[PDB]
Amino acid sequence: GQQMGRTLYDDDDKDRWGSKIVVVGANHAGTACIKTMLTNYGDANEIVVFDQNSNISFLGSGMALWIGEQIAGPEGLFYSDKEELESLGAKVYMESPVQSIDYDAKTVTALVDGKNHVETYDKLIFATGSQPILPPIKGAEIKEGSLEFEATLENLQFVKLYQNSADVIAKLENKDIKRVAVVGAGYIGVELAEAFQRKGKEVVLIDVVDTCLAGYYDRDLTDLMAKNMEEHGIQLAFGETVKEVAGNGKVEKIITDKNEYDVDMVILAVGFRPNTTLGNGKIDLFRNGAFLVNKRQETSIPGVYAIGDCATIYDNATRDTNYIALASNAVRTGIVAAHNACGTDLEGIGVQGSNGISIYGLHMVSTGLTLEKAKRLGFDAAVTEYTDNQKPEFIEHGNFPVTIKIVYDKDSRRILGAQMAAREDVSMGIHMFSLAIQEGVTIEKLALTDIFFLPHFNKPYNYITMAALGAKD
Amino acid sequence: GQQMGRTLYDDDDKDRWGSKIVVVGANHAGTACIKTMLTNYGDANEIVVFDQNSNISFLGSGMALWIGEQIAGPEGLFYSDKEELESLGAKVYMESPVQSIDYDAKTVTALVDGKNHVETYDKLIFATGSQPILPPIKGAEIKEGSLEFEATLENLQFVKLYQNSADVIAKLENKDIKRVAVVGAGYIGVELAEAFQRKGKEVVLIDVVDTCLAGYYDRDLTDLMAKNMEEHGIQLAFGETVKEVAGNGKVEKIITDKNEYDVDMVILAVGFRPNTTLGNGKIDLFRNGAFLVNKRQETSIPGVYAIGDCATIYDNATRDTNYIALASNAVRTGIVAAHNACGTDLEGIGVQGSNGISIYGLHMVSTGLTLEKAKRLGFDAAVTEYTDNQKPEFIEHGNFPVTIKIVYDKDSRRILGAQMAAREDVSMGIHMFSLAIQEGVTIEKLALTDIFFLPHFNKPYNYITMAALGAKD
Ligand SMILES: Cc1cc2nc3c(=O)[nH]c(=O)nc-3n(C[C@H](O)[C@H](O)[C@H](O)COP(=O)(O)OP(=O)(O)OC[C@H]3O[C@@H](n4cnc5c(N)ncnc54)[C@H](O)[C@@H]3O)c2cc1C
Ligand SMILES: Cc1cc2nc3c(=O)[nH]c(=O)nc-3n(C[C@H](O)[C@H](O)[C@H](O)COP(=O)(O)OP(=O)(O)OC[C@H]3O[C@@H](n4cnc5c(N)ncnc54)[C@H](O)[C@@H]3O)c2cc1C
């Protein structure tokens, strides 16, 4: 629940053509794009939407919370629906997959009620997102025909759509489900591990990489998180390649590189790939298939835009085109495309891949590049860190230690990334670093940056300042 | 006590100069400056310090916490002392006021142990700070010659030095002190009002301005804080000029131009003014008497610097010279003056007057200009505000509303200030805006800034993004 009127971008419509705008996909990106277009230019344009799913505007980010019983039910996991979009002026086709696009005649063909539906367009917006990847695992295959990623082996699950989360939660009811294996230690696999453990199941987290949250946090924080999970009953099996998921009629064992585990359910959280096949090669693609787009979210074909997990985005930390699959980027890229497709020139500004994670009371946040990542990409990076209490030691209650890492370029001196971890929520602080990187602020300028002081809130020489002042080179 | 090794600014000694450097004053500004010089350039320079007080390196910021018994006395309110500074390499003179400066023979004269002591210098750093403001009030006079702001009338108090607090606490135990009047409704007056209230005394907060926290927060938030204090029995008497403090040998009643109040003690917290008497008309001063300094904290007299509360500072919100008496600025100007004084070219970057306040569980933070203040300064400013919960509606516990205000220039579009209030600590969020104002970020660019999303921490359409998108002007 977060609605409003027009944005500060909304521009007076004058001397511009009216446009029929077709949107393919209506989840985070599509919904954000559609709402901005309608609430800002309303009747000026004709918005037609197609989504192959039976539901839209779902919050996948809330699936772990729901499975782990951290929230009552799935009610609040939807931020819009067909009726709401239509009440804004959109024409919406549910369970209608667009199956081909003719860029010359400017029409899309979608399967509406078992029949081919041709829809003309002036502007086309791709918000088709992505789909989960199936690693080469014996016993793991998908049932042909389903757009819901159903596994052939009972109790082997994928976790992307609402149905997937509902499916898992139903099965968890079965008293036989006692041991669950989660494959993939990225942020999704980690949250799911906590979720299943929170449901009382024995959990084993498997990944071929040597730690969890690889690429988002440095060694000491991924170690802290791993420790966090272990001390909660989650068994860690890092550095192991899954070979097979076996079982007679259902999941009964998961076999890896270095071991075998008796489990009653397997969850695959290894990654996703963008849905850009509708491009038919006509559109330039990023190395991973994502639609390549500029700062206005426009593809190599004029009039055709791409947003969210199906397209790329500019990364101000690496300072190159990149692919960052986050609902946060979906919302913002959707807003940008909305204005541009409606005739308002709006240049996006890139992102930093800012993220947060909260598992069993361990709170962390990061933005930009970790020291490992920065180095691995040829940056002459260094890190300055500091661990200290949030408030002055004389504060009798509510104090706590915070660990902060500030990764910067030894050469250019600009901040490349930052990470924070604490047993209390200090996430609001990562916003500063997100902006820092965006603006190219250096470790030297940060050190003297005005960070207020109030003993009730912080120390005169807070950890941000101490970290920056303590940088070397 | 927040010690550390060398800063990232430390420049390797090459053909530079070693100097005899005299520092006048050793509270927040002097201490920070002396430590930076000695820790970064040790033996190269000769540091001599003079302070007229019997205690140095005190955290005046904790006085209300101390008085209101929120902490264990003043045990943690000192961040250094004579022996510490001497061990770092400085010669320290306590209870030794500097009475005159000979800018020609570059020497200062201090009253040491009663006799006159002369000290020559290559560089001079003024850190004489400020003194409380004392408007024309009958019966309110500081005893001639006291260096501790002692009022001639018994039970009329100032709250600036360590002694002033111990003095109030001393008289506070007097079972006869029942009603206490606090003159000045700025953050210090509000904090002291709460302190005396916690001591079970009846408090009446008087100020000429018709509101509390004038210039720090806009009317709806100051209304919030006013109602907050009244919720705890504090009486408010705004829009009144204190004309006289009267009584038979002691305080018995305070009279304004509109009313009269029967009180047993009066605390004057009208504000502070720079202590720049030692300038002797030889140094350029700012409109309020503060030593006018440049980006390097150097005065109009080469070789002479001024830091903290006795000097000006550059304000990036107004984009001009200004006076902002805060420990945060005291510390930073000290660091900059120290390096430049020791031969390292270091240009300060200005501040935003960022601040915070926490009273009876109401936490507020602001930075830069309020709409009313921006306008009082001639800016064609506008504000965009928003109120929503910190997290998604489906969050079981730990959720709370937050009100945010972003003030911006309707013409240049750059952010001028920002305010936030909630009953849960969101103070970390103001750092982003302080940095945003520093970097001249526009309201349009702010709206697309990469604000991460995690249901446990915030909403996809968080209030920062919503308020920004909501810019109307
Ligand atoms: C468990 C989990 C937790 C997550 N947590 C967070 C988090 O805490 N914070 C964060 O920022 N992000 C999080 N994410 C990521 C976020 O959910 C995605 O980045 C976001 O959903 C992408 O939105 P989208 O609209 O681009 O694409 P998608 O959500 O992939 O949606 C694409 C839509 O288009 C439709 N579609 C596809 N092809 C066609 C077609 N051919 N014709 C018609 N319709 C079509 C699909 O049915 C779908 O509705 C999480 C994801 C998961 C799975
Ligand atoms: C009740 C209260 C609450 C506050 N709360 C906050 C807060 O929460 N956050 C924040 O950022 N700031 C706060 N402040 C402001 C902060 O305390 C000041 O900004 C800071 O102390 C200024 O440090 P300074 O060294 O520049 O000056 P001062 O503290 O004024 O010290 C100047 C020093 O120089 C000495 N001196 C002066 N003249 C001479 C002389 N002629 N010869 C020799 N020595 C001399 C004095 O004895 C003194 O020790 C608060 C202040 C008060 C009083």
Side-chain angles (χ1 to χ4, degrees), chain B residues 244-278:
Chain B
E244 175 189 1
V245 170
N248 294 311
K250 62 172 63 180
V251 167
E252 281 185 289
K253 62 197 164 192
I254 184 166
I255 317 179
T256 71
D257 63 310
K258 307 298 256 299
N259 291 294
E260 178 180 302
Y261 306 91
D262 284 337
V263 295
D264 307 299
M265 182 184 269
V266 169
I267 276 59
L268 298 177
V270 173
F272 304 119
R273 47 165 294 195
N275 190 330
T276 56
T277 184
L278 296 172

Short mmCIF file of all heavy atoms in Angstrom, two decimals, chain B residues 244-278:
data_model
loop_
_atom_site.label_atom_id
_atom_site.label_comp_id
_atom_site.label_asym_id
_atom_site.label_seq_id
_atom_site.Cartn_x
_atom_site.Cartn_y
_atom_site.Cartn_z
N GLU B 244 12.66 40.64 33.28
CA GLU B 244 13.35 40.68 34.56
C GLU B 244 13.26 39.42 35.41
O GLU B 244 12.25 38.72 35.42
CB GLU B 244 12.81 41.86 35.39
CG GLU B 244 13.37 41.93 36.81
CD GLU B 244 12.66 42.97 37.68
OE1 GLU B 244 11.72 43.63 37.19
OE2 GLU B 244 13.05 43.12 38.86
N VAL B 245 14.35 39.14 36.12
CA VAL B 245 14.42 38.03 37.05
C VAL B 245 14.54 38.79 38.38
O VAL B 245 15.47 39.58 38.56
CB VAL B 245 15.69 37.17 36.81
CG1 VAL B 245 15.86 36.16 37.96
CG2 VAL B 245 15.58 36.43 35.47
N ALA B 246 13.59 38.59 39.28
CA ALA B 246 13.59 39.30 40.56
C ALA B 246 13.49 38.38 41.76
O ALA B 246 13.19 37.19 41.62
CB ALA B 246 12.45 40.31 40.59
N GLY B 247 13.73 38.95 42.95
CA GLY B 247 13.65 38.18 44.18
C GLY B 247 14.40 38.78 45.36
O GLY B 247 15.32 39.59 45.18
N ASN B 248 14.02 38.38 46.58
CA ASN B 248 14.67 38.87 47.80
C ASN B 248 15.99 38.14 48.08
O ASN B 248 16.02 37.18 48.85
CB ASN B 248 13.75 38.68 49.01
CG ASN B 248 12.51 39.55 48.94
OD1 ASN B 248 12.59 40.75 48.68
ND2 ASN B 248 11.34 38.95 49.18
N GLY B 249 17.07 38.59 47.44
CA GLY B 249 18.37 37.96 47.64
C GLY B 249 18.59 36.70 46.81
O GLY B 249 19.72 36.23 46.67
N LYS B 250 17.51 36.17 46.25
CA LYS B 250 17.56 34.96 45.43
C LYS B 250 16.46 35.06 44.38
O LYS B 250 15.69 36.02 44.36
CB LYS B 250 17.30 33.73 46.31
CG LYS B 250 15.92 33.73 46.95
CD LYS B 250 15.59 32.43 47.66
CE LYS B 250 16.55 32.16 48.80
NZ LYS B 250 16.24 30.87 49.50
N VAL B 251 16.39 34.07 43.50
CA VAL B 251 15.38 34.07 42.46
C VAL B 251 14.03 33.75 43.08
O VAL B 251 13.91 32.83 43.88
CB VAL B 251 15.71 33.03 41.37
CG1 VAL B 251 14.50 32.82 40.47
CG2 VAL B 251 16.89 33.50 40.53
N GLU B 252 13.01 34.51 42.71
CA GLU B 252 11.66 34.28 43.22
C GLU B 252 10.57 34.46 42.16
O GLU B 252 9.46 33.96 42.32
CB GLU B 252 11.39 35.19 44.43
CG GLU B 252 12.02 34.68 45.71
CD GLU B 252 11.67 35.51 46.93
OE1 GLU B 252 12.16 36.66 47.04
OE2 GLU B 252 10.89 35.02 47.79
N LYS B 253 10.89 35.16 41.08
CA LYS B 253 9.92 35.36 40.01
C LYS B 253 10.57 35.89 38.74
O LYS B 253 11.50 36.70 38.80
CB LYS B 253 8.80 36.31 40.44
CG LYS B 253 9.29 37.70 40.79
CD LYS B 253 8.24 38.46 41.59
CE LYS B 253 8.85 39.68 42.28
NZ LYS B 253 7.92 40.27 43.28
N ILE B 254 10.08 35.43 37.60
CA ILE B 254 10.61 35.87 36.32
C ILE B 254 9.49 36.61 35.60
O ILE B 254 8.36 36.13 35.52
CB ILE B 254 11.15 34.66 35.50
CG1 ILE B 254 11.79 35.16 34.20
CG2 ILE B 254 10.04 33.65 35.24
CD1 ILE B 254 12.64 34.12 33.47
N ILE B 255 9.81 37.79 35.10
CA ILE B 255 8.80 38.60 34.44
C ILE B 255 9.06 38.81 32.96
O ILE B 255 10.17 39.16 32.55
CB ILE B 255 8.67 39.97 35.14
CG1 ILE B 255 8.68 39.78 36.66
CG2 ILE B 255 7.37 40.65 34.72
CD1 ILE B 255 8.58 41.06 37.45
N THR B 256 8.03 38.58 32.16
CA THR B 256 8.12 38.77 30.72
C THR B 256 7.25 39.98 30.42
O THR B 256 6.66 40.57 31.32
CB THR B 256 7.58 37.55 29.94
OG1 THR B 256 6.15 37.50 30.07
CG2 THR B 256 8.18 36.25 30.48
N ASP B 257 7.17 40.36 29.15
CA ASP B 257 6.37 41.51 28.76
C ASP B 257 4.87 41.17 28.75
O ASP B 257 4.04 42.06 28.56
CB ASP B 257 6.79 42.00 27.37
CG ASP B 257 6.56 40.95 26.29
OD1 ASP B 257 6.98 39.79 26.48
OD2 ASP B 257 5.97 41.30 25.25
N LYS B 258 4.54 39.89 28.95
CA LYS B 258 3.15 39.44 28.95
C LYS B 258 2.70 38.83 30.27
O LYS B 258 1.52 38.92 30.62
CB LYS B 258 2.91 38.43 27.82
CG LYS B 258 3.35 38.90 26.44
CD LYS B 258 2.59 40.12 25.97
CE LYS B 258 1.55 39.75 24.94
NZ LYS B 258 2.16 39.14 23.73
N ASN B 259 3.62 38.21 31.00
CA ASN B 259 3.26 37.59 32.28
C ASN B 259 4.38 37.62 33.30
O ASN B 259 5.45 38.19 33.08
CB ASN B 259 2.87 36.12 32.08
CG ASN B 259 1.57 35.96 31.34
OD1 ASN B 259 0.51 36.34 31.84
ND2 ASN B 259 1.64 35.41 30.13
N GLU B 260 4.10 37.00 34.44
CA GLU B 260 5.05 36.90 35.54
C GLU B 260 4.93 35.47 36.06
O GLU B 260 3.84 34.90 36.10
CB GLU B 260 4.70 37.89 36.63
CG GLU B 260 5.60 37.82 37.83
CD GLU B 260 5.22 38.83 38.88
OE1 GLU B 260 5.20 40.03 38.55
OE2 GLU B 260 4.92 38.42 40.02
N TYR B 261 6.06 34.89 36.45
CA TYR B 261 6.06 33.52 36.93
C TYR B 261 6.81 33.42 38.24
O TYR B 261 7.83 34.06 38.44
CB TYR B 261 6.72 32.62 35.88
CG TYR B 261 6.09 32.74 34.50
CD1 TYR B 261 6.57 33.67 33.57
CD2 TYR B 261 4.99 31.95 34.14
CE1 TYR B 261 5.96 33.81 32.31
CE2 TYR B 261 4.38 32.09 32.89
CZ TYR B 261 4.87 33.01 31.99
OH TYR B 261 4.25 33.17 30.78
N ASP B 262 6.27 32.64 39.16
CA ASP B 262 6.90 32.45 40.45
C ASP B 262 7.78 31.21 40.33
O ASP B 262 7.28 30.09 40.21
CB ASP B 262 5.84 32.29 41.54
CG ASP B 262 5.19 33.62 41.92
OD1 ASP B 262 5.81 34.70 41.70
OD2 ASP B 262 4.07 33.60 42.45
N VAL B 263 9.08 31.42 40.37
CA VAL B 263 10.03 30.33 40.23
C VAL B 263 11.16 30.41 41.27
O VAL B 263 11.43 31.47 41.83
CB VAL B 263 10.64 30.35 38.80
CG1 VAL B 263 9.54 30.06 37.77
CG2 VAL B 263 11.27 31.72 38.52
N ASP B 264 11.82 29.28 41.49
CA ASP B 264 12.90 29.19 42.46
C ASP B 264 14.28 29.15 41.82
O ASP B 264 15.30 29.26 42.51
CB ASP B 264 12.69 27.94 43.32
CG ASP B 264 11.30 27.88 43.93
OD1 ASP B 264 10.97 28.79 44.71
OD2 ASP B 264 10.55 26.93 43.63
N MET B 265 14.31 28.99 40.50
CA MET B 265 15.56 28.93 39.77
C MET B 265 15.30 29.31 38.32
O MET B 265 14.20 29.10 37.81
CB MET B 265 16.16 27.53 39.83
CG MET B 265 17.51 27.39 39.13
SD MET B 265 18.11 25.69 39.12
CE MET B 265 19.07 25.65 40.63
N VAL B 266 16.30 29.88 37.67
CA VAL B 266 16.16 30.28 36.29
C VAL B 266 17.42 29.89 35.55
O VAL B 266 18.52 30.19 36.00
CB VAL B 266 15.93 31.81 36.15
CG1 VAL B 266 16.06 32.24 34.69
CG2 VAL B 266 14.55 32.18 36.67
N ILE B 267 17.26 29.18 34.45
CA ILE B 267 18.39 28.76 33.63
C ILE B 267 18.31 29.55 32.33
O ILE B 267 17.28 29.52 31.66
CB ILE B 267 18.32 27.24 33.31
CG1 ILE B 267 18.92 26.42 34.46
CG2 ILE B 267 19.08 26.93 32.02
CD1 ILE B 267 18.23 26.63 35.80
N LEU B 268 19.36 30.28 31.99
CA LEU B 268 19.34 31.03 30.74
C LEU B 268 20.03 30.23 29.64
O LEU B 268 21.24 29.99 29.69
CB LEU B 268 20.01 32.39 30.90
CG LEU B 268 19.36 33.35 31.90
CD1 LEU B 268 20.20 34.63 32.00
CD2 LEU B 268 17.93 33.67 31.47
N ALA B 269 19.25 29.78 28.66
CA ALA B 269 19.78 29.01 27.56
C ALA B 269 19.35 29.69 26.27
O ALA B 269 18.72 29.07 25.42
CB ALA B 269 19.25 27.57 27.61
N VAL B 270 19.68 30.97 26.16
CA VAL B 270 19.32 31.76 24.99
C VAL B 270 20.20 31.47 23.78
O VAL B 270 19.82 31.76 22.64
CB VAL B 270 19.39 33.27 25.30
CG1 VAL B 270 19.17 34.08 24.03
CG2 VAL B 270 18.35 33.63 26.35
N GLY B 271 21.38 30.91 24.01
CA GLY B 271 22.28 30.61 22.92
C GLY B 271 23.71 30.98 23.23
O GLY B 271 24.03 31.28 24.38
N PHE B 272 24.56 30.98 22.22
CA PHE B 272 25.98 31.31 22.40
C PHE B 272 26.51 32.29 21.38
O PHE B 272 26.02 32.36 20.26
CB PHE B 272 26.82 30.03 22.32
CG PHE B 272 26.40 28.98 23.28
CD1 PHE B 272 25.96 27.74 22.82
CD2 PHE B 272 26.41 29.23 24.64
CE1 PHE B 272 25.52 26.77 23.71
CE2 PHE B 272 25.98 28.27 25.55
CZ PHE B 272 25.53 27.03 25.08
N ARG B 273 27.53 33.05 21.78
CA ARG B 273 28.17 34.01 20.89
C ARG B 273 29.69 33.78 20.96
O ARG B 273 30.23 33.50 22.03
CB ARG B 273 27.83 35.45 21.30
CG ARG B 273 27.99 35.71 22.79
CD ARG B 273 28.00 37.20 23.10
NE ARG B 273 29.17 37.85 22.54
CZ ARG B 273 29.59 39.07 22.88
NH1 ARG B 273 28.93 39.78 23.79
NH2 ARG B 273 30.67 39.59 22.31
N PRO B 274 30.38 33.88 19.82
CA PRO B 274 31.83 33.66 19.84
C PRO B 274 32.60 34.55 20.81
O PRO B 274 32.28 35.72 20.99
CB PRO B 274 32.24 33.89 18.38
CG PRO B 274 31.15 34.75 17.82
CD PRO B 274 29.91 34.18 18.46
N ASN B 275 33.62 33.97 21.44
CA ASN B 275 34.47 34.70 22.39
C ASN B 275 35.69 35.14 21.61
O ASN B 275 36.69 34.43 21.57
CB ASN B 275 34.90 33.78 23.52
CG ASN B 275 35.58 34.53 24.65
OD1 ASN B 275 36.22 35.56 24.43
ND2 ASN B 275 35.45 34.01 25.86
N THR B 276 35.62 36.31 20.98
CA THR B 276 36.73 36.78 20.17
C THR B 276 37.37 38.08 20.65
O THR B 276 37.93 38.84 19.85
CB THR B 276 36.29 36.96 18.70
OG1 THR B 276 35.16 37.84 18.65
CG2 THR B 276 35.90 35.60 18.09
N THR B 277 37.32 38.33 21.95
CA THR B 277 37.90 39.55 22.51
C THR B 277 39.40 39.69 22.19
O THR B 277 39.89 40.79 21.93
CB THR B 277 37.66 39.60 24.04
OG1 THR B 277 38.15 40.84 24.56
CG2 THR B 277 38.38 38.46 24.73
N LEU B 278 40.13 38.57 22.19
CA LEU B 278 41.57 38.59 21.92
C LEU B 278 41.94 39.10 20.53
O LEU B 278 43.12 39.29 20.23
CB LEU B 278 42.16 37.20 22.10
CG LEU B 278 42.10 36.63 23.52
CD1 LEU B 278 42.53 35.18 23.51
CD2 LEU B 278 42.98 37.47 24.44
#
